[PDB]
Amino acid sequence: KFKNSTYSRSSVDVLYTFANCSGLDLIFGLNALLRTADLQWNSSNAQLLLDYCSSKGYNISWELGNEPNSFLKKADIFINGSQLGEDFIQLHKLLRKSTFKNAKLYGPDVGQPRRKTAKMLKSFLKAGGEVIDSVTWHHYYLNGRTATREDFLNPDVLDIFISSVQKVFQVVESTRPGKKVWLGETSSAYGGGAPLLSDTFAAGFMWLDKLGLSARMGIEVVMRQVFFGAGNYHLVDENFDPLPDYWLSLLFKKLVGTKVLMASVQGSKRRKLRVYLHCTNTDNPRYKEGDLTLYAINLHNVTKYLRLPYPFSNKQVDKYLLRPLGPHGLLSKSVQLNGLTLKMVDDQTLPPLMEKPLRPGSSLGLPAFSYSFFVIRNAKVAACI
């Protein structure tokens, strides 16, 4: 199934210029299965790529290997985490001797922390943990081939993510205390996504919850599989149309700040009503220092009404409620923000993201199977200023 393939200077150029023109920071995964006589990493192809990227003044960050935990299954080669650690030390020497000597290095891009994966991540961080800037690991909830509609709406499925995060931090804290932890590749379902699920309004429950738990639990960066590509889990289809998860991502980018706080529901039945609280993004021109962004998921089959605690009860709140455009309900590929369909104005213009001012003191309405952001204006939270 897995044949060796080549790529050109042209390909590199396409990739870098996409990122540069888009204002994104490229991380490039290097081939870890290029092996010397005694299963040492052969850095000679990476040397060719590093030289060329240097010769063009490309500022790139690096990874080495994808899911090394399954190299045996993929290529009948087993590389233990100690050897992989030594391989990263060798790549780090090459970066230091390069034109970009401060270039960042991330790894080891392991799968979710099963016992054999946890063992490999521990031996990797013992041996090579000194040279990585962040620990990367991967998470998918489901097999795209078998995933059901009910799975995408199931708090019991959402909650499995929590123990995966706990096991990763248990390995990191026992080997490289305080090292930053990143989700280097993550989505709803593997095998390219669940057909008619991973590309719909229903995909939003898993995506917003994963962002809320990641921020709440200490994950610094979450990398969405994929922005664009063959798989159903794309934010943008091959006709360059944005799916509901693109719009959800854009609202999150505009409204949600870097400072993570906490919200919880009294009666403590944190299953189907899921709530997350950050400081408002200060890049948002509309809002000011001290403002709060609440986001909420309602997996109940009825509307829930949320009451804000003192001293926020009577603040002006801006609602950003996402609902599917019919007739396909949760399986729709179109979303409305406060009743207006989200659609590009033209190929060069994203639309405004129009808030709905609620009357102060009112309870926050969250319809069945929906998610919403709520900005609490003039919150005056000192933690946020």
């Binding site: 870890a32 922005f227 804000l308």
Partner: protein
Amino acid sequence: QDVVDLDFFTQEPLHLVSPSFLSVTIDANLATDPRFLILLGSPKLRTLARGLSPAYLRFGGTKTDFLIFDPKKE
């Protein structure tokens, strides 16, 4: 009753996420698509990408370990 009281902790940040907290990938697989240049050239796609700035764009996936740089290829 479908009314639900929220409790908030607001006395200090519990964590700081990157300004790039919501990042994205492009799968290594896409660089085997004959139309790679046309696809990532799309100015529509770059408009959509720029909306998620600032962010990392991670290029990687299973094919990461099956891709070889060739300085001769066109």
